[PDB]
Each structure stands twice: as C-alpha cells, then as structure tokens.
Design a protein around this nucleic acid. Structure first.
Ligand SMILES: [K+]
Ligand SMILES: [K+]
Ligand SMILES: [K+]
Ligand SMILES: [K+]
Ligand SMILES: [K+]
Ligand SMILES: [Mg+2]
Ligand SMILES: [Mg+2]
Ligand SMILES: [Mg+2]
Ligand SMILES: [Mg+2]
Ligand SMILES: [Mg+2]
Ligand SMILES: [Mg+2]
Ligand SMILES: [Mg+2]
Ligand SMILES: [Mg+2]
Ligand SMILES: [Mg+2]
Ligand SMILES: [Mg+2]
Ligand SMILES: [Mg+2]
Ligand SMILES: [Mg+2]
Ligand SMILES: [Mg+2]
Ligand SMILES: [Mg+2]
Ligand SMILES: [Mg+2]
Ligand SMILES: [Mg+2]
Ligand SMILES: [Mg+2]
Ligand SMILES: [Mg+2]
Ligand SMILES: [Mg+2]
Ligand SMILES: [Mg+2]
Ligand SMILES: [Mg+2]
Ligand SMILES: [Mg+2]
Ligand SMILES: [Mg+2]
Ligand SMILES: [Mg+2]
Ligand SMILES: [Mg+2]
Ligand SMILES: [Mg+2]
Ligand SMILES: [Mg+2]
Ligand SMILES: [Mg+2]
Ligand SMILES: [Mg+2]
Ligand SMILES: [Mg+2]
Ligand SMILES: [Mg+2]
Ligand SMILES: [Mg+2]
Ligand SMILES: [Mg+2]
Ligand SMILES: [Mg+2]
Ligand SMILES: [Mg+2]
Ligand SMILES: [Mg+2]
Ligand SMILES: [Mg+2]
Ligand SMILES: [Mg+2]
Ligand SMILES: [Mg+2]
Ligand SMILES: [Mg+2]
Ligand SMILES: [Mg+2]
Ligand SMILES: [Mg+2]
Ligand SMILES: [Mg+2]
Ligand SMILES: [Mg+2]
Ligand SMILES: [Mg+2]
Ligand SMILES: [Mg+2]
Ligand SMILES: [Mg+2]
Ligand SMILES: [Mg+2]
Ligand SMILES: [Mg+2]
Ligand SMILES: [Mg+2]
Ligand SMILES: [Mg+2]
Ligand SMILES: [Mg+2]
Ligand SMILES: [Mg+2]
Ligand SMILES: [Zn+2]
Lengths: 147, 153, 150, 110, 307, 43
RNA sequence: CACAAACGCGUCUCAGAGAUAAUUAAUGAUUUAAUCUUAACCUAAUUAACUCAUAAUAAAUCCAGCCCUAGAACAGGGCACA
RNA sequence: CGAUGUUGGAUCAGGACACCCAAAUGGUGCAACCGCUAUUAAAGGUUCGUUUGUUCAACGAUUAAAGUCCUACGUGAUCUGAG
RNA sequence: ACUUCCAAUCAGUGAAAUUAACCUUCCCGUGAAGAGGCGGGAAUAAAAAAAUAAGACGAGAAGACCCUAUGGAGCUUUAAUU
RNA sequence: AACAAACUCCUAGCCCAAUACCGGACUAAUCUAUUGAAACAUAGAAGCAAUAAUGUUAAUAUGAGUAACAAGAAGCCUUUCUC
C-alpha cells in the first residue's frame, strides 16, 4: 500500500498539485497470497458497526481474508490515502484481483510493472546443488549418532 | 382499515346518512333530474335503482308501500311512483338512471358535482358525450378488418 | 482580500522594453485654483517644477487649467487607454513632484493583484516533463504481461 | 415546541418551490364540438349544460303555475310542447306544457 | 408538442367497440390452445432425476379455505389454490443470473392487452401469449430446464409433498405502534392524560439519539412473506386446484408463488414426483378426478368407526 | 474506551508520554556544548 | 360481530453447513527417556456468538376516467371474455 | 441559581460480565442422587400476588432461573404525583 | 369492533411563543469537568409530505430552595429610644 | 540525515504584541468668524460618531401559508322536506 498510495495520489509526478486531477491507475494482482509479518494473521482485527444496536462485529485478519480475498489490501490503501473528499474518487482507479485473472481490457492499458518491495526468500528445495556444495559445512557430526 | 366497506360516512352519523339520502331521493322522484355533490349522488344512485324495483312489485304489495312510505317524505309522490315511474320502466332491468359529472360549482367550496336523472324524463337532454362517428379514419380502417373477416369466416 | 477583488497576470503592454522602451504616460491635466488656499501646493509646483518636468519628459503633454475649484486634481492618461484620477489637495511641493514622478513610471495597467511575479513565453526549453520522459523503453514496446505474437 | 433558529431564505426557497408543491398542468382539456368552448374529456361542457339548465328552469317554472298547490303532482306522464306544435296521438292522455319560444335545436321531438 | 392523453376506448366508435373486444378475445383462445402440446412442438431434452435437483414452481390464485378431516379424527384447514394460466416465459442461463443455478420465469393469470406497457405487450407478442398479471423468478438447476411457452398445471404437485408459499400479505396501512409491534399500552383510567397507545420512551438520555433499529409507527402489512412446510393434501385435476395445509399469506383472489419446500428435512423428496414437470400428453392416460393423500377422509368414504 | 482522569497533564494521574530517541540526542548535544562552555571559562 | 370486514380467546408455520473458548487425546524434538506443541507436519473430541448455504425482491418510459381485500397525500393492482 | 425539574412505579428498553438459568469442562472430604468450588461463553430468558408512597424487606404460590450494576442512581417537550 | 368531533387532501381567511450567523451527521478521545463545530477516524446526490419525542444542558418566568446585601417589609416581645 | 516557528540571517522599508489605568498624534459630520464658490482652508464652539443595555418607536421577516375558524338538503328561489 505504501507505493500504491503514492501512485494514486500522483506524488510521483513533478507536476503534482492537490487541486489538479493528476492520478494514475494501479492494478494489483495475486492479492490472495499476501504475507502478513509476524503473528498479525491472528492478532490484527478489523472491526465495523452496522449501526443497529448489538451490531458491533470484530473480524480477525485471517477470517476476513478467508471471506473477501481483496479486503485486506483494499482497507490498507483506503486508510493511507488523504482523508479529503478526493479519496473516494481516487479509490475508483484502484483495481484489485485475487489471482492472475485480469480482463483483456485492463491488460492492454498497462505501461510498466513496479518492483516488489520485499525480496522473497527461497526455500531449501529451491537452492541449486551448486549452491549447496558452495556453502561450507560448519561442523562435523559424530559418526555414531542417530538422526 | 376500511377493507370491504361499500358505504360512505355522510352527515352526522348512520341515521343522518339515511335522512340526507331521503331528501335527495324525494327530490329525484319529484323533479326527475337533480344535481348534488358527486359523493352524495353516487350513494343516491344505488337507492334510486332499487326503489324502482320495489315500485314494479305493485300498488297492493304491503312491503313496497311501507318502503315507499319511508323514502318518499312527500306524500303526493307515492301515487306518482306506482303509476308513472313504475309503468314506464318495464323493459330494462337495471338501466334506470344516468350519472354524469357536472363541472365544479362556482362557489368557494369548489365541490365535485354530479347530475342524476331518470330515463325518459320530460326535460331537455343532457349534453351526453358522443362517440366518434364510424366515418372517422381510425374507424374506417377497423371496418376494413370486419368486412374482410365476415367475408371469409 | 484576494477573493474579493479581481486578478491579472504580469503583462507588459505592446511588448514594451523588448525592442525599445516607450514611455507609456501620454498626458496630464492639472485643475488648480488661483485663490483657494488648498491649491497652494499645485500653484508652487506649476511655477517651479512643471517647466523642468516637461523638458525631461518630451513624450507627455501637460495641460494647466486654473479655474475655480475646491479640490485640485491631476488626470493622467496612458497609451493603452487607462485614465487615472488623482487628488493633489493640500500637499507640499515635494509631495506633488513625487506623485507626478510616480505617474510617469507606471505602465498604465490596472493596479490589482498580480498572480505571479514573473511572465514568460515558451518556458519549456529542452522539453517539458511528461510521464514518458524518464521511463525506459522495452524491447518491442511490450506491455508488462503481453504475450509475443510469434 | 419552539424553533431554535431562523430558517434562511435559501432553505425556504427549496421547500416552497419543490416540484411536489408546484401546480401540475392539465393535459385533458378539449374543445367542445358543439359550441367551441373549453371542457375536460370526462366532464360535461359547462356552456352546453348551462344552456340546458336555463331551459329546464323555464319548463319547471311553467309547471308550477299549472299546479297551484304545493302537494299537487300529476298521476300521468308529462310532455312539453313549444309554439307551432300540437299534441300527437301517442302524446294524448298526458299533461301539456306550453312554451311561447320556438322549439330549441338541441331539444328533439319524438 | 403537448400531446393529449389517450386510451384505447377514446376514438373507437359504438359500432367497433364490440368488434375490437371480439378481435382480441379470439386471439387469446387461439394462442392459449396452440400451446397445449409441449411434447409435440420440439421440446428441450429431458434428463433423469439427480440428487440435489430443484424443480419449477407455479403461480396460483387463492380462492378460500375449507375444513378437512383425517382418518385419526383430527380436523385440518386447507386453502384452495387454483392455477388459472401458468406458462414459463423466459429462460436465463446459469452464468447470467446467479452463477450457481439457472432462472426460469413464470407468469400469472391472463390480463387485458389495453392496460399494459408497450414493451410488455411487445415481449409477449414475440412469444405468442396473452399478457400475464404477476411475473416471478424461479431458481432451477440445469437438469430441470423447461422450454419457454410450456404450460403448467396443478398436477405438477403430487399429494403428500411439502410446499412453500410466497405472496404479499394483507396491507393494513399506517398502523400505530401497538398494532404494528405489539407494545403494551398505558392504563386507561388511573389518571393517565392523553396517553393510552403511545410507544413511550424511545431511547436513553445519554446517547442523545435514536438507534436505527428502534420500533416506530409506520407502514404495516404490504410486504412479501413466505410460509414454509405446508403439506399438500388434495390435488384437483380438471379445475387445477391445490389444497395446502394451514394458512397462506395474502388476501383472497391474490396471486401466490408456490414452490417445493426448502427445509432441510424435506430435501430430495422429488424422486417420486414428475420431473421436470407433469406433461399430460406423454402419459396418454387420464388422471383421477381428485388425488387424495393416504390420511384424508374422502367425502365418499364410510363414517369413522374407532372399533 | 480508556480515559485519562481530569486534565491529561496535571494532577496525580497524568499521561504516560515517554521519552523518545530524538529527545535523548537533543539533551546530549546541549550537554556537549555546555561541557565546552565550562572549559573556556576555567583558565 | 345490526357492512360485504376487522379482531382473539381461534387456526397455521418455524431450518442445514462452516467456525470456535476452557478442556481432553494422539505423534514428537530442544533433553535420542518422557512430554497435547507461544517446537514443526498431520490428525481427533469439543460452549455460545458469528459467517454463509438457502429463501424473499426483479419487466425502464398504457395511465385521462372509474373500481379495489392498495392507500394520509403521492404511489400500487385491476377496467378482453365479467 | 436572566432555572441542569426532584423519589417510586407505567411504557420502551441500549450496554457491561464480576453469570441466576440454558451449553462445554477441571477439582473434591465427587460411588449414584443431591451438593460445594474453579475455568470458558452475554445470542435469548429472568413470574404472578397480600401489607407499605415506597426502592428495600417480610410472607403465600410457582418457575429452567426470578442475577449484580451502569445508562442525568436511563426514560415527566410520553403518562402518573401516593411521598 | 363501530360511530361523531379532530385528523389527511381540495377551496377561502389566516395567529403565537421562538430566532447571533448556519452549507445544522455518527463514534471514541479531548476540553469551563456531558461536542452537529476541536483531534483521530467513519458515513455522505439534492429536495417534499406524514409520523414517534432521545438530544439541541429545548421554549416559557433576570430561581420560589440556599447564601450574600452595614437592601426592604409583616408579625411578637423580657431589644433600644419614647 | 531530512522535514520543521512570532526565533535569526537575506532584499526593501514607514524599524518590534497585549487586558484595567495613564500619555500622544491625527480625524468623520454639524454651526459661527474670515477665506472658498463643481464643496474647501486656518481658527473658535458643541445635543461632536453605536455590531451589543431580555434598550425605545416605526417597519420587516422566521415559526407559516402552519395552529385555528364557517353555510342542514333539493327546487319552480324562496317553497316544500330532515332535525
Ligand atoms: K489528571
Ligand atoms: K517439554
Ligand atoms: K441552578
Ligand atoms: K441480558
Ligand atoms: K426529541
Ligand atoms: Mg371503501
Ligand atoms: Mg363530515
Ligand atoms: Mg361507488
Ligand atoms: Mg388497506
Ligand atoms: Mg391496556
Ligand atoms: Mg391536564
Ligand atoms: Mg384519556
Ligand atoms: Mg452522541
Ligand atoms: Mg406510509
Ligand atoms: Mg478531561
Ligand atoms: Mg507526563
Ligand atoms: Mg521420544
Ligand atoms: Mg446471504
Ligand atoms: Mg397501475
Ligand atoms: Mg439560558
Ligand atoms: Mg423502570
Ligand atoms: Mg436489555
Ligand atoms: Mg467470565
Ligand atoms: Mg448452567
Ligand atoms: Mg431519573
Ligand atoms: Mg420520574
Ligand atoms: Mg406533560
Ligand atoms: Mg425529557
Ligand atoms: Mg400529595
Ligand atoms: Mg388550506
Ligand atoms: Mg445537511
Ligand atoms: Mg464527549
Ligand atoms: Mg476532523
Ligand atoms: Mg471532527
Ligand atoms: Mg401537517
Ligand atoms: Mg410532523
Ligand atoms: Mg450548540
Ligand atoms: Mg432537559
Ligand atoms: Mg430551558
Ligand atoms: Mg437572579
Ligand atoms: Mg427562603
Ligand atoms: Mg458587611
Ligand atoms: Mg438596612
Ligand atoms: Mg432605609
Ligand atoms: Mg408601614
Ligand atoms: Mg424595653
Ligand atoms: Mg522554517
Ligand atoms: Mg506595547
Ligand atoms: Mg483578569
Ligand atoms: Mg474644523
Ligand atoms: Mg451623542
Ligand atoms: Mg444604528
Ligand atoms: Mg426572553
Ligand atoms: Mg438594540
Ligand atoms: Mg419607518
Ligand atoms: Mg408566511
Ligand atoms: Mg410545522
Ligand atoms: Mg386543522
Ligand atoms: Zn359545449
């Protein structure tokens, strides 16, 4: 959301000004595979009130993502944009998709892809055998131990 | 909740409702054409239809005489009902009276007026709404369908 | 306030000062009195400074019309057509000279709020910024997730 | 209860000029074929009915003079005859109302 | 152009008004009688019953109520629902309506052409049916789709089944809080002043507002309601009358939406029922005049003896 | 839901506002300057 | 219950899946024992909420007049055979 | 203090959990039954009468239970005025 | 349940308390210690008619309770003067 | 690091906030003494300046086209009916 908020506002154009209608569309795909850091999947909660008495609902982050796949990202951006009346206008330019199923109309409008802000670590099975042999063996286990 | 209520609240109550229609009905029998408020005339139509039905029963039937005694508050109209109105209506069954909407009264209240009258009265005819003549363009086109339909079927 | 009054951009009439400088002041008309004590400043200015002022500025025409009046006035007209009324009622000699000198240096445009302290034509030297002026071009102009034709 | 503040004219104009409170136009106005005046489609012509009502009052006024008593009513049918006409064979046995004016065009003899 | 308002009877002459009525009336009978061969006009393929399948409901007219007695001596009240004119109107594909089940449109009883919209009249002209009064949407699985224009009869429901009923209830207008919600009223004589049916306190002092769920006087009655678990006792064939246990919402001579019950207990109770609907032509046999449930005391049955 | 009784900066119960890392550096920068101040006044 | 209706004292109907807290049990390492695990993987028994399946709503653009079990007004349903 | 109308009831109830009942469970000087005690859970429910202006309390009958407390000790531009 | 006077629609005449300006929301927090206006967030095309009275510390009377005033008055006497 | 004041530099100056009380310089509009004569000058005099007293008088709004008020019926027009 940090880089998506900048693009929506237009804070990347040197011609920026709040009165002007400068703003860029952002298309975010694979929003079902987001990775919350730490234990925020079970600790962070999203709460809302329906208005009627006894209508206070608190939903855990895991529960909300299991029901609405794009709700986690949309709420994160919806809270980072400026709190004026332009926030409703500039949220309409944000397109969210749970997976890589994008309509052909949207695909033909794209220009460039923003880099990922977090370098994804690779698992043990993704390391090539050349890398495994290159990394030194730190210790020498005894021959008589049973693993 | 007025579901199924076919009668109307008029005057000072159920008793005053009958008396208001009693005076209107008496005027309708004597003059054969009266004008009043549209709501009161609409109610009066129902009684004027059935009063002739009691008149057809005869001068000798006691129920008809007692029924006509109450409704005809002027006592010189009972012979008229059994000897003029009743003999005149022998053919038709329910086509006794006509109701038309007179324009609003030229007064402050601006009530919705109606004119109620008996068939065959000795008065100038009302300006009834006349339908389009068969020579009109729309009617002539439709008559073409009927002539062709009757030619084959 | 700024929202109450009108505004204009910094503009020079007839592109003045580009090829040559032309004094935009055109004429002055002094309406003073010969007996009114309030016209003393105007009378002293006419006797002493008017003759020298005309020599320094040959492009203006000075009219002096001594007539019965209570409030002396000086009317200045400019080339673009703007006429500015002024009152020299009960002022010292040096105040009149300062006031008249200021009217000689004004371009004649309306004295209202100027939106910007600069004016320029064709400021986009070596190009103006557009969202494609700093984005590298991809081989074949392919979209981020576009499949190649072959 | 009492109002808390004075209603501004901006609010009053919105309420006093709402489309509900405005007068609606009427699209059921037509010209009467007989007299050329104005009437509504579902309402009898005002001019034509007033023409009839004036004549009906004259006929009824003549009937009053033919029955002096307040409780005198005919026991037979009634027929109205104008100047230059005589009762027919089918019209015999009925009371006769005589009017001096010529028979009106709209009124039709049988 | 301030064009004047018009109606069908405005410009028609006295010699053509009876003719036009005959013209439209003859068209309706020809159109209705030409649809009485659903299996002879190239119908859509029919699939065998499968678990979890849903059938198509009907639109019927509520006549009244009758008492009915069972073989154990108990008394039940049944509501006479008559199917007058029921035809499937249009079929919506699965992916264009909900994404899970297809939608089948069913019309109500026949109405006059002269009082319907231009688009509504044009829509029925293409299909070839007289206009209907009420139109409802039914959720039907893909294995029970019916070709539009296929008539439906009261035999679609076999006695012994549990059905639902959806119709607009009786509208009581703007009714007070005592009638609408059932609040108790204030006492009548112990000094009470101008307070006998008012709601009373509507909130608390601290909140300084009225909660959105607060009960207040307002409209009562004219809304859509559904009755579940109504058992079908008797089916009449020639008159197309359905008998349903209990009371169905809606006033007399109203149109009622009938469907198979969706209660969890009454699931998959359609294997022994016509699928996708009862076609009288295919059977080539005459059904009984009345279909009775096994527990119903028939009018021509010997009197109950508890021996 | 949780309120600070009375005024939030006076009284027995106050706001738990902690000292920040920026505030520590400001104190040290002033201390270093004053440490040099008392050396030039020494002799 | 002196309206063709309203009404109760009368009659009718009332539901599946997920998901959990304390707690209980299996496999097992830091600690080659054991050990329900703010150790991993898989898996089991298990409050109420809650969420959802499902059901209700569905036709853009006749509408002067009359009727209506529709209604404060405005709207709504009928007016071909009745 | 150029006014924030004051006890109890009537109507309508919003909320908390330090739970009276309903559901799950640990311990016992827990055999079963009836109990005592602790953990978890607030969607629903928590009676009708005699005396007192009474809240409170006593008493009769009953219920799965007749919970504690906040809400201007809720609620008089909705009512009551016994105190 | 049903009537009458009110009531709602149409036609005529047409008043009162009140009113700093209002383009007059909800929640938590703050604050002259109970916020439509402050702060942090939520909600948000604009108007009309008919209803219920939680809030605007609602409207009405320069608080009758309480205290103050070297401000009054009525009543009583074993106050002072007479 | 950066971003950040009524602070402090930079370019011009007419070159440093405020409640009670106190000091000073100017000044709107009247009348008079002399000037002035498309509306002023130097002086001498005062009924010498109103966004605020539940202010006074008069006129306007808002509340509001809201609260509330009235004529028994028909006809042949003033005669018969209903109370
Ligand atoms: K404090
Ligand atoms: K362990
Ligand atoms: K007080
Ligand atoms: K509770
Ligand atoms: K209120
Ligand atoms: Mg009615
Ligand atoms: Mg009346
Ligand atoms: Mg009628
Ligand atoms: Mg109704
Ligand atoms: Mg009661
Ligand atoms: Mg009273
Ligand atoms: Mg009373
Ligand atoms: Mg609030
Ligand atoms: Mg309503
Ligand atoms: Mg505080
Ligand atoms: Mg502190
Ligand atoms: Mg082990
Ligand atoms: Mg759902
Ligand atoms: Mg309609
Ligand atoms: Mg006050
Ligand atoms: Mg209470
Ligand atoms: Mg409650
Ligand atoms: Mg607990
Ligand atoms: Mg329990
Ligand atoms: Mg209280
Ligand atoms: Mg009270
Ligand atoms: Mg009161
Ligand atoms: Mg109150
Ligand atoms: Mg008392
Ligand atoms: Mg009016
Ligand atoms: Mg607003
Ligand atoms: Mg607050
Ligand atoms: Mg804010
Ligand atoms: Mg705010
Ligand atoms: Mg009103
Ligand atoms: Mg109201
Ligand atoms: Mg306020
Ligand atoms: Mg209050
Ligand atoms: Mg007050
Ligand atoms: Mg006072
Ligand atoms: Mg006192
Ligand atoms: Mg003292
Ligand atoms: Mg004293
Ligand atoms: Mg004194
Ligand atoms: Mg005295
Ligand atoms: Mg003494
Ligand atoms: Mg700065
Ligand atoms: Mg100072
Ligand atoms: Mg002070
Ligand atoms: Mg002077
Ligand atoms: Mg003065
Ligand atoms: Mg003034
Ligand atoms: Mg006042
Ligand atoms: Mg004043
Ligand atoms: Mg005046
Ligand atoms: Mg007004
Ligand atoms: Mg009002
Ligand atoms: Mg009124
Ligand atoms: Zn005419």
């Amino acid at each position: 959301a940090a880089m998506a908020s900048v693009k929506l506002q237009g804070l990347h154009k040197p011609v920026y000004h709040q009165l002007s209608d400068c703003g860029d569309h952002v298309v975010i795909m694979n929003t079902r595979h987001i990775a919350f850091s730490g234990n925020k999947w079970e600790q962070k909660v999203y709460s809302s009130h329906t208005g009627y008495p006894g209508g206070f609902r608190q939903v855990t982050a895991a529960q909300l993502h299991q029901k609405d796949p794009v709700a986690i990202v949309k709420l994160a951006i919806y809270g980072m944009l400026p709190k004026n009346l332009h926030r409703r206008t500039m949220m309409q330019r944000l397109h969210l998709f749970p997976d890589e199923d994008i309509p052909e109309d949207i695909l033909k409008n794209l220009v460039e892809e923003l880099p990922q802000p977090r370098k994804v670590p690779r698992r043990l099975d993704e390391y090539t055998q050349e890398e495994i042999e290159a990394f030194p063996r730190v210790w020498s286990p005894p021959e008589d131990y049973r693993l | 909740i007025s579901h199924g209520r076919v009668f109307r609240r008029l005057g000072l109550g159920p008793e005053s409702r009958i008396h208001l229609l009693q005076n209107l009905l008496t005027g309708l029998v004597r003059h054969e054409r009266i004008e009043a408020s549209w709501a009161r005339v609409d109610e009066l139509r129902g009684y004027a239809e059935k009063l002739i039905d009691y008149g057809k029963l005869g001068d000798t039937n006691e129920r008809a005489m007692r029924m006509a005694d109450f409704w005809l508050t002027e006592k010189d109209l009972i012979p008229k009902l059994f000897q003029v109105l009743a003999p005149r209506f022998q053919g038709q069954n329910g086509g006794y009276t006509r109701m038309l909407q007179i324009p609003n009264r030229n007064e402050q209240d601006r009530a919705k007026m109606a004119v109620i009258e008996y068939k065959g009265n000795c008065l100038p005819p009302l300006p009834l709404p006349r339908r389009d003549s068969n020579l009109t363009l729309l009617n002539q086109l439709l008559q073409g369908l009927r002539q062709d339909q009757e030619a084959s079927s | 306030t700024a929202r109450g009054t009108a505004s204009r951009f910094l503009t020079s009439v007839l592109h003045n000062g580009l090829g040559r400088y032309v004094q935009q002041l055109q004429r002055l008309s002094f309406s003073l009195s010969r007996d009114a004590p309030s016209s003393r400043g105007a009378r002293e200015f006419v006797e002493r400074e008017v003759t020298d002022f005309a020599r320094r500025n040959p492009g203006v025409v000075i009219y002096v019309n001594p007539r019965p009046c209570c409030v002396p006035r000086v009317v200045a007209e400019y080339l673009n057509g703007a006429v500015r009324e002024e009152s020299i009622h009960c002022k010292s000699v040096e105040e009149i000279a300062a006031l008249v000198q200021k009217l000689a240096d004004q371009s004649g445009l309306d004295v209202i709020r100027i939106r910007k302290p600069f004016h320029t034509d064709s400021p986009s030297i070596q190009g103006q910024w557009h969202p494609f002026t700093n984005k590298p071009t991809t081989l074949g102009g392919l979209r981020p997730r576009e499949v190649q034709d072959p | 209860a009492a109002p808390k503040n004075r209603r501004s004219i901006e609010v009053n104009r919105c309420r006093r000029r709402n489309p509900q409170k405005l007068i609606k136009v009427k699209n059921n106005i037509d010209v009467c074929p007989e007299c050329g005046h104005l009437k509504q489609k579902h309402i009898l012509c005002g001019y034509c009915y007033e023409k009839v009502r004036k004549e009906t009052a004259e006929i009824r006024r003549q009937m009053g003079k033919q029955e002096g008593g307040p409780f005198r009513a005919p026991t037979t049918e009634t027929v109205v005859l104008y100047s230059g006409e005589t009762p027919s064979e089918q019209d015999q046995g009925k009371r006769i109302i005589e009017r001096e004016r010529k028979r009106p065009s709209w009124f039709t003899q049988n | 152009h301030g064009k004047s308002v018009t109606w069908w009877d405005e410009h028609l002459s006295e010699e053509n008004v009876p003719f036009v009525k005959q013209l439209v009336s003859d068209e309706n009978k020809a159109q209705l009688a030409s649809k009485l061969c659903p299996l002879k006009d190239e119908p859509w393929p029919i699939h065998p019953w499968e678990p979890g399948s849903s059938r198509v409901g009907l639109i019927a007219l509520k006549l009244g109520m009758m008492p009915l007695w069972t073989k154990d001596g108990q008394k039940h009240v049944v509501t006479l629902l008559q199917v007058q004119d029921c035809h499937v109107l249009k079929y919506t594909p699965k992916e264009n309506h909900n994404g899970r089940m297809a939608a089948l449109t069913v019309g109500g009883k026949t109405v006059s052409h002269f009082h319907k919209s231009a688009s509504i009249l044009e829509f029925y002209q293409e299909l070839g049916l007289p206009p209907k009064q009420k139109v409802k949407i039914f959720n039907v699985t893909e294995n029970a789709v019916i070709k539009p224009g296929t008539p439906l009869y009261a035999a679609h429901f076999r006695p012994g089944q549990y059905v639902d009923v959806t119709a607009k209830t009786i509208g009581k207008g703007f009714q007070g809080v005592m009638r609408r919600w059932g609040f108790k009223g204030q006492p009548a004589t112990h000094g009470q002043t101008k307070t006998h049916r008012r709601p009373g306190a509507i909130s608390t002092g601290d909140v300084a507002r009225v909660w959105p769920g607060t009960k207040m006087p307002g409209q009562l009655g004219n809304i859509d309601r559904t009755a579940f678990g109504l058992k079908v006792w008797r089916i009449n064939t020639k008159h197309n009358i359905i008998y349903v246990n209990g009371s169905v919402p809606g006033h007399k001579n109203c149109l009622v939406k009938i469907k198979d019950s969706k209660l969890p207990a009454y699931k998959d109770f359609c294997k022994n029922l016509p699928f996708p609907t009862y076609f009288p032509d295919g059977d080539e046999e005459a059904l009984p005049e009345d279909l009775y449930d096994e527990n119903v005391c028939q009018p021509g049955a010997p009197s109950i003896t508890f021996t | 839901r949780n309120r600070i009784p009375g005024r939030q900066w006076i009284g027995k119960h106050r706001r738990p506002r902690p000292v920040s890392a920026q505030a520590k550096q400001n104190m040290i920068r002033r201390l270093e300057t004053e440490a040099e101040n008392q050396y030039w006044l020494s002799r």
